[PDB]
Every structure is written in C-alpha cells, then in structure tokens.
Amino acid sequence: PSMKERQVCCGARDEYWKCLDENLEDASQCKKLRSSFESSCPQQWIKYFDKRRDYLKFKEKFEA
Amino acid sequence: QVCCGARDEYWKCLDENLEDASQCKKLRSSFESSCPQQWIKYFDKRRDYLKFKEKF
Amino acid sequence: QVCCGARDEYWKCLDENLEDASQCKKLRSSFESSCPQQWIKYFDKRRDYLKFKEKFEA
Amino acid sequence: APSMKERQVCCGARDEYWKCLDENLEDASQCKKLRSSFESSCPQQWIKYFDKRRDYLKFKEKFEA
C-alpha cells in the first residue's frame, strides 16, 4: 500500500471524522464522506479507524 | 526505509536484473510505500534519462 | 511511521497538555520525520483553524 | 533525527554530487562546489555513511570486473 494511497486514505478519514464531530456521531449526515472513506482505504484500515473512533469517544464519556 | 534508501535498493535491483522491472516488483512496492508519488515521477524520469544516457 | 499516525500522536499530546507545544517536542520531531514539509504546513493550518473553531462556538 | 524535508534535501545534494563523480570517473577536484553543497545539506553521520557507501560500491565494481 503506497504512500499516495495512505495520503488519500488519511484525507478521506479526516473529512469523514470532521463531519462526525460537527453532527455528534450521526452517520446519516456523513453518507457521501463515509462512502469516499470506504472507497479510499484498505478494508483493515477502515476496521482500525472505526474501532479507534469508538474507543476515543467512549473514553471521553467514561472520563467526563 | 528512508525514501532515497528504498529508491536506491529498487535501482540496485534494476541494475542487477538488466533494467527488467518484472524482476523488482517487491522492491518497487517498498519504493512506492516510502516515497510521495510526485518524487517517484521525478525519480522515474531521472533514472530513464540517466540509464539511456549510459547506453548512448 | 505512517505520516498521519505520527501527526495524530503529536495532536493527541497537544490535547493532553492544554494545547501546550513545549511538552510535545519529542512527538513533533517524529511528526516532522514522518511527513513531507508541504503536508506539515497544511496540517498545522488545519489544527490552528479547528482548535480555534472549538473555542469560537464552545 | 533529521525531518523528512532534511533527508529529501540531503538526498538531492548527494544525487547531484554522485552524478558529477560519475561524469569525471571519481575525480573529486571537478565537483568541489557540489561536494560543499552535499556537506551543508547532510548531517555529519549521513556524509560519513554515503562516503563509505560510495567507496564500497566503486571498489566492489572494480573487484568484480
């Protein structure tokens, strides 16, 4: 998986996660960005980032 | 692998395999994985030119 | 190793220390080592804008 | 530990220097300008590495030919 593929995957993840921050984890507002994210990233990266997002957002509330 | 490190090892394989890219697919991956695509485009043009100049 | 991994670890440190860059100088080095300078400049503008937007509303 | 940009600039400076040496069959004198640009562009331990790497590669070529 090339450096350009990583750049493009990260960019698509940045935009997707940004949307989620501006709509309190509401997938329905970020449908096209989620689609680009899946199109832009290897299957095992998508799983990594989805699980990381859960951990981080739940750790916040456990701490809150 | 530093970008120019992975590039130099790819170029070494090309040398040792008479410029036949088919023999160097593994090292082509590490190169692509180590270097921005803009740099790879530059590096491919420098190599193509310099190897051609060599034979000339 | 991956440019965005090193960026995210640097940004995680900035969060944890009240956006205080002086604490996170180690991971700033690894960020600079992992990412081309053109990407760093963009990422630094993105962070400045987003962190500022955080306050401007909250 | 040098940044990615520092490694890139070191590599470019090294490339142009090694190119010059190839065009003058290792004659240092005709590349002194590029030599200087290589030393300023590269950390001390990188200069050492690429100098010893150059020697090994050139002498390995002669040994085999």
Residue numbers in the entry:
A (entry chain D): 50 to 113
B (entry chain C): 56 to 111
C (entry chain A): 56 to 113
D (entry chain B): 49 to 113
Quote from the publication.
Coa6 is a soluble IMS protein with a CX9C–CX10C sequence motif, which binds Cu(I) with a KD(CuI) of ∼10−17 M. Coa6 deletion in both yeast and human cells results in diminished COX assembly and activity; however, this defect can be partially rescued by exogenous copper supplementation and in yeast by treatment with elesclomol (via a proposed elesclomol–copper complex). Here, we present the crystal structures of human Coa6 and the pathogenic W59CCoa6-mutant protein. These structures show that Coa6 has a 3-helical bundle structure, with the first 2 helices tethered by disulfide bonds, one of which likely provides the copper-binding site. Patients with mutations in Coa6 suffer from mitochondrial disease due to complex IV deficiency.
The structure of W59CCoa6 shows four molecules (A, B, C, and D) per asymmetric unit. The noncovalent dimer observed in the WTCoa6 structure is maintained for W59CCoa6 (between molecules A [cyan] and B [gray]) through contacts along Helix α3 from each monomer. In addition, each of these molecules form a covalent dimer with another molecule of W59CCoa6 through a disulfide bond between the introduced residue Cys59 on each chain (covalent dimers between molecules A/D, [cyan and salmon] and B/C [gray and gold], Fig 4B). In this way, the asymmetric unit is composed of a dimer of dimers (a noncovalent dimer of disulfide bridged dimers). The superposition of the WTCoa6 structure with the noncovalent A/B dimer of W59CCoa6 yields a r.m.s.d. value of 1.2 Å for 113 common Cα atoms. Importantly, in the WTCoa6 and W59CCoa6 structures, the positions of the proposed Cys58–Cys90 Cu(I)-binding sites are identical. Under reducing conditions, the elution profile for the W59CCoa6 protein was identical to that of WTCoa6, corresponding to a dimeric protein. These observations agree with the crystal structure described here, which shows that W59CCoa6 oligomerization is mediated by the presence of intermolecular disulfide bonds that bridge noncovalent W59CCoa6 dimers. Oligomerization of the protein, through the creation of intermolecular disulfide bonds may inhibit or eliminate targeted protein–protein interactions between Coa6 and proteins such as Sco1, Sco2, and COX2, which are critical for its function.
